[PDB]
């Protein structure tokens, strides 16, 4: 054929082991020179620029960087120029050209070259996506290009994961071999961040090459941080925390009542509430969702505040004996105990209830007066006042009398009634020049107090009769005298 | 001498009597004709214009208006041509010329003529000013020019006035006589407007001639119309009347307090007062003054109106047992009876006095309350209100108790005091999580009503002790319980 050569492009082995660069070459058959000679140049391809001599036919003298480090396999007559390099060092990493020298001027450095890689760590392969719920296999590939040493693979750190299935050397690229050992297992959610190792060693040697890899198994989110039932005060500051554990980024969503609120892709998400209202009260849910699953939790938020000022509706005015129904109603976030009461006495009390009802079957006059409803509670108390008035027929009090002075007589009669009664004075006497009797009447509470003055009345005290009328009834007391 | 004649200018007598026109004439002595003749022409002086012939020598034929009515006295030889005309009538009033006819062409009508007045009424003379206090004389003159009849004068209507002093005939002007009768008297104030008369009559005849005159005696003013003590209402209308009796115009002057007010020259003078004030009250004097005297009277004017609203000054605040002095003072035009009083009781009363004083030696708490001072009176009543407050050490009322409910206990203690006392609750227990006790305290009158609620207290009722402090004192009641 024509000039040329076959050689692997890339080839590799470990520090301290050998390599075996396989090859083959060709020259024009047209020439028949016996004793085919060749040379192996490191780094550089042509003689002009002196390269290190890896091998040269019928010369023990080579580069000191290969002395006792190189040897050729195969008769070059059969065009077989495979080269072995024992005891490798990082220095020996480089490109290796091959050149042939048959006869004179028939010398050719072949353009195809192999590049020698020297690694000190094995190769662990892992698929891009490693879902937790799915079986996933991983391999371990080590360049078995050495005829003198035979690597054996050992999964370390595999622990509880399934046992390794060993495989032999396999064809890599064109003309290079590699020993592979597989590993079949299933990953827990936790498995992410676990360090998995593969070790290659050689039976008689002290050579051991370890190599690590940390897995990245994807798992759905599990909400691990969530508040218990939160009970907060109005206007206070409320921080809700939703934590989530997921390998892929999780999406966090705060929701309540079918609404959006706050949403973010993070490991934890705060919901800050300022100026808290009873409308903020309710159950809040945090939803965590990932393409690989989801999880959600709820928390009951309870807003607590002192009850509002009580509202009292019912009956304000009522005649005697009628039945007065009064209810005192107040909404409160924390259940509260409340009570209503007049001065000097407490009418009714209810405990931990929304509203209290007071009923007075028959109403005496003493029921007239202002009342108080207090909505007592842990977080504060507010009250409200309501008045209850009671109407009745006027009652002329026996505190009434006719005191006479030396020249004139004057009388006082007091009655009580809620509708202020028409006071009047009568006396059996005819009409006189005036000298007109004149009364004055001031009112305080239910009491109508009125004082008459009859002037120039004879020493014999005149019968004075007091009468007062309201809508409901009438009364008339013939007044007494208080001499000396 | 020369031609000429003497004759009275004016001369008069009554209807029905005679006249006696005296005369005398003269002609040039140079001529000596015997048998001097003359004529008396009425009205006209010369013959050309025919006049009535009163007399003509040696002719019985005269004017028919003088036939048997005329006659001549004295020989014309002695130049005496006096003429008498009996039975006079109003017709015979006129001028009378005299003319002489001695010889031919020696005829002369003398330029001097007498005019005959005929009156039917006497002449009464009165001085211009007739002061009442002064003696004043009046005369009565009657023309005594008749030789045949002799008038006699008689004062009629003179009555109580001094008797008349008769006088004889007196020389009037030149050649006429008049009978005068005087009258000496003194005039009362009343005498003005009195009719005084003088009558002349003749003994044998039926002829009587009366003549009157009404006197105008000046007298000082005497105030005869004057009001008694006038007692009037404010804003009413007041008419003061001052009447005065005087012949000359009197000057009327209304005065008070040394001031002018109203002044007028009249018989009566009104002082009208509208919108009467207590400042109008006082004594008003009416002065009457005339150049001939003066008189004056006074009237007390009293303005009456309901008392003003009472003013109460003194002490409003006072501790227990202290003495409270309060006075209620009110000015009033009509004296009024007033009184002060609380509800249901009347403290004090005074009658017909300007002010009333109330004193409360020791002040109990029940003295706290509003008081009324009413200034009662005939013409209206007004009042005023004053409050009296009384401070004292708080008194914890035995209406207080500790009522327990099934889950919680609540206590009520009421105290009374005017300075609102600091209520407090104590109990022998250490500090607990809260669950904080909470009290409510409303105030009404002197009563501080307060209710505690102690929550979750064990079935065994805890000792509750109520304490209240004011400036004056402190009290503490260990409260009781009311089971079932
Ligand atoms: C041709 C070429 O691309 N070479 C360039 C380089 O120059 C080389 O220099 C060396 C120095 O000894 C040689 O002269 C070489 O030619 C020879 C050799 O000795 O390798 C002569 C041989 O006889 C000849 N072949 C045959 C069949 O006779 C060989 C052979 O053709 C080549 O080696 C094949 O690669 O070549 C010169 O080629 C030098 O200029 C470098 C850098 O500039 O560039 C090369 O392209
Ligand atoms: C002079 C005179 O003022 N007279 C005026 C009037 O005229 C008279 O008319 C009468 C008519 O008879 C006489 O003519 C009068 O004269 C006499 C008489 O007869 O009275 C004539 C007498 O002789 C003569 N006196 C003497 C001494 O002789 C008298 C005598 O002198 C007067 O009487 C004296 O008063 O007069 C006329 O005088 C006549 O015109 C009236 C109206 O117009 O006015 C007279 O002034
Ligand atoms: C009277 O009103 C009662 C309660 O009033 C309502 O509730 C209170 C807490 C406040 O919110 C107030 O504003 C509300 O109006 C009712 O429950 C009751 O049925 C009503 N009925 C009447 C008029 O007696
Ligand atoms: C308090 O005042 C008394 C009276 O007040 C006066 O008289 C009354 C009628 C009203 O006219 C009022 O305007 C006047 O001021 C005094 O008489 C008394 O002296 C006073 N003394 C006090 C202050 O106690
Ligand atoms: C070249 O020699 C090597 C070592 O003897 C051998 O492995 C390879 O098969 C040979 N190649 C040939 C003969 O083509
Ligand atoms: C909820 O829990 C977080 C810790 O995970 C805490 O910081 C926060 O205060 C809690 N929320 C409330 C309202 O206490
Ligand atoms: C929580 O997730 C479940 C499924 O895991 C879903 O059925 C449910 O509706 C979710 N709840 C909320 C409030 O999102
Ligand atoms: C109730 O009546 C009292 C009088 O005793 C009065 O002071 C108060 O203002 C009244 N309150 C209402 C709400 O009517
Ligand atoms: C005129 O005569 C009368 C009457 O005889 C007489 O009164 C008067 O004195 C006589 N006058 C004389 C004479 O002068
Ligand atoms: C005073 O008296 C007159 C009558 O002389 C009378 O008209 C008037 O009304 C009186 N005045 C009063 C105030 O009565
Ligand atoms: C009244 O008149 C007398 C004299 O008649 C006099 O002294 C007195 O001052 C007068 N009074 C008045 C108030 O004018
Ligand atoms: C007096 O006190 C009463 C309360 O009992 C009040 O209603 C009234 O307005 C007070 N009056 C004065 C003048 O202070
Ligand atoms: C080798 O030398 C050159 C390389 O192409 C050619 O002349 C021929 O292929 C020969 O075999
Ligand atoms: C009368 O006549 C006239 C009047 O004066 C005069 O001549 C004389 O006075 C005589 O006596």
Tab-separated table of N, CA and C in Angstrom, chain A residues 378-424:
chain	number	residue	atom	x	y	z
A	378	UNK	N	-59.554	38.683	79.651
A	378	UNK	CA	-58.087	38.641	79.736
A	378	UNK	C	-57.361	39.824	79.090
A	379	UNK	N	-57.747	40.158	77.864
A	379	UNK	CA	-56.968	41.091	77.057
A	379	UNK	C	-57.514	42.512	77.120
A	380	UNK	N	-58.365	42.765	78.110
A	380	UNK	CA	-58.943	44.081	78.314
A	380	UNK	C	-60.435	44.010	78.560
A	381	UNK	N	-60.981	45.057	79.169
A	381	UNK	CA	-62.411	45.114	79.435
A	381	UNK	C	-62.996	46.453	78.999
A	382	UNK	N	-64.184	46.397	78.411
A	382	UNK	CA	-64.911	47.599	78.029
A	382	UNK	C	-66.330	47.484	78.551
A	383	UNK	N	-66.958	48.624	78.807
A	383	UNK	CA	-68.311	48.626	79.333
A	383	UNK	C	-69.224	49.501	78.492
A	384	UNK	N	-70.516	49.433	78.787
A	384	UNK	CA	-71.490	50.314	78.169
A	384	UNK	C	-72.618	50.543	79.170
A	385	UNK	N	-73.226	51.722	79.121
A	385	UNK	CA	-74.247	52.079	80.098
A	385	UNK	C	-75.619	52.207	79.457
A	386	UNK	N	-76.639	51.722	80.158
A	386	UNK	CA	-78.010	51.876	79.697
A	386	UNK	C	-78.933	52.255	80.850
A	387	UNK	N	-79.890	53.131	80.559
A	387	UNK	CA	-80.853	53.595	81.550
A	387	UNK	C	-82.192	52.877	81.433
A	388	UNK	N	-82.777	52.544	82.578
A	388	UNK	CA	-84.095	51.922	82.621
A	388	UNK	C	-85.037	52.779	83.453
A	389	UNK	N	-86.067	53.333	82.820
A	389	UNK	CA	-87.014	54.188	83.532
A	389	UNK	C	-88.357	53.486	83.719
A	390	UNK	N	-88.971	53.711	84.878
A	390	UNK	CA	-90.207	53.033	85.247
A	390	UNK	C	-91.285	54.015	85.672
A	391	UNK	N	-92.388	54.048	84.934
A	391	UNK	CA	-93.470	54.981	85.225
A	391	UNK	C	-94.514	54.367	86.153
A	392	UNK	N	-95.135	55.201	86.984
A	392	UNK	CA	-96.121	54.725	87.947
A	392	UNK	C	-96.988	55.848	88.499
A	393	UNK	N	-98.147	55.479	89.040
A	393	UNK	CA	-99.051	56.429	89.687
A	393	UNK	C	-98.343	57.113	90.848
A	394	UNK	N	-98.558	58.427	91.010
A	394	UNK	CA	-97.772	59.201	91.975
A	394	UNK	C	-98.044	58.750	93.398
A	395	UNK	N	-97.000	58.672	94.212
A	395	UNK	CA	-97.159	58.248	95.594
A	395	UNK	C	-96.820	59.392	96.530
A	396	UNK	N	-97.832	59.903	97.228
A	396	UNK	CA	-97.633	61.052	98.100
A	396	UNK	C	-97.007	60.610	99.430
A	397	UNK	N	-95.781	61.069	99.660
A	397	UNK	CA	-94.986	60.600	100.788
A	397	UNK	C	-95.433	61.257	102.081
A	398	UNK	N	-95.408	60.492	103.167
A	398	UNK	CA	-95.870	60.987	104.460
A	398	UNK	C	-94.860	61.922	105.119
A	399	UNK	N	-93.819	62.289	104.376
A	399	UNK	CA	-92.872	63.305	104.823
A	399	UNK	C	-93.497	64.691	104.666
A	400	UNK	N	-94.714	64.715	104.126
A	400	UNK	CA	-95.420	65.953	103.813
A	400	UNK	C	-96.209	66.498	105.002
A	401	UNK	N	-96.288	67.823	105.100
A	401	UNK	CA	-96.882	68.467	106.268
A	401	UNK	C	-97.245	69.928	106.029
A	402	UNK	N	-97.996	70.498	106.968
A	402	UNK	CA	-98.313	71.921	106.950
A	402	UNK	C	-97.756	72.615	108.187
A	403	UNK	N	-96.605	73.259	108.029
A	403	UNK	CA	-96.006	74.023	109.115
A	403	UNK	C	-96.513	75.457	109.077
A	404	UNK	N	-97.001	75.941	110.213
A	404	UNK	CA	-97.549	77.286	110.284
A	404	UNK	C	-96.592	78.242	110.985
A	405	UNK	N	-96.385	79.408	110.381
A	405	UNK	CA	-95.625	80.474	111.018
A	405	UNK	C	-96.597	81.492	111.609
A	406	UNK	N	-96.082	82.417	112.412
A	406	UNK	CA	-96.939	83.292	113.210
A	406	UNK	C	-97.887	84.162	112.383
A	407	UNK	N	-97.456	84.577	111.194
A	407	UNK	CA	-98.307	85.411	110.348
A	407	UNK	C	-98.913	84.624	109.191
A	408	UNK	N	-98.143	83.693	108.636
A	408	UNK	CA	-98.621	82.909	107.506
A	408	UNK	C	-98.366	81.423	107.683
A	409	UNK	N	-99.055	80.622	106.880
A	409	UNK	CA	-98.890	79.178	106.897
A	409	UNK	C	-98.300	78.727	105.571
A	410	UNK	N	-97.413	77.741	105.612
A	410	UNK	CA	-96.863	77.206	104.375
A	410	UNK	C	-96.784	75.684	104.425
A	411	UNK	N	-97.125	75.055	103.305
A	411	UNK	CA	-97.267	73.608	103.251
A	411	UNK	C	-96.343	72.972	102.225
A	412	UNK	N	-95.909	71.753	102.524
A	412	UNK	CA	-95.025	71.001	101.645
A	412	UNK	C	-95.523	69.576	101.464
A	413	UNK	N	-95.782	69.191	100.220
A	413	UNK	CA	-96.096	67.800	99.927
A	413	UNK	C	-95.206	67.288	98.805
A	414	UNK	N	-94.624	66.114	99.021
A	414	UNK	CA	-93.759	65.499	98.025
A	414	UNK	C	-94.333	64.173	97.564
A	415	UNK	N	-94.334	63.977	96.254
A	415	UNK	CA	-94.782	62.722	95.680
A	415	UNK	C	-93.681	62.195	94.778
A	416	UNK	N	-93.667	60.890	94.543
A	416	UNK	CA	-92.734	60.350	93.570
A	416	UNK	C	-93.498	59.706	92.423
A	417	UNK	N	-92.970	59.902	91.218
A	417	UNK	CA	-93.520	59.341	89.991
A	417	UNK	C	-92.539	59.632	88.865
A	418	UNK	N	-92.515	58.782	87.843
A	418	UNK	CA	-91.598	59.004	86.731
A	418	UNK	C	-92.166	60.001	85.725
A	419	UNK	N	-93.465	59.895	85.398
A	419	UNK	CA	-93.990	61.069	84.701
A	419	UNK	C	-94.277	62.172	85.716
A	420	UNK	N	-93.559	63.291	85.627
A	420	UNK	CA	-93.696	64.379	86.595
A	420	UNK	C	-95.147	64.829	86.719
A	421	UNK	N	-95.706	64.709	87.929
A	421	UNK	CA	-97.138	64.875	88.186
A	421	UNK	C	-97.547	66.320	88.431
A	422	UNK	N	-98.764	66.664	88.025
A	422	UNK	CA	-99.289	68.001	88.252
A	422	UNK	C	-99.648	68.179	89.720
A	423	UNK	N	-98.858	68.976	90.430
A	423	UNK	CA	-99.123	69.239	91.838
A	423	UNK	C	-100.209	70.307	91.973
A	424	UNK	N	-101.053	70.165	92.990
A	424	UNK	CA	-102.148	71.102	93.210
A	424	UNK	C	-102.520	71.190	94.687
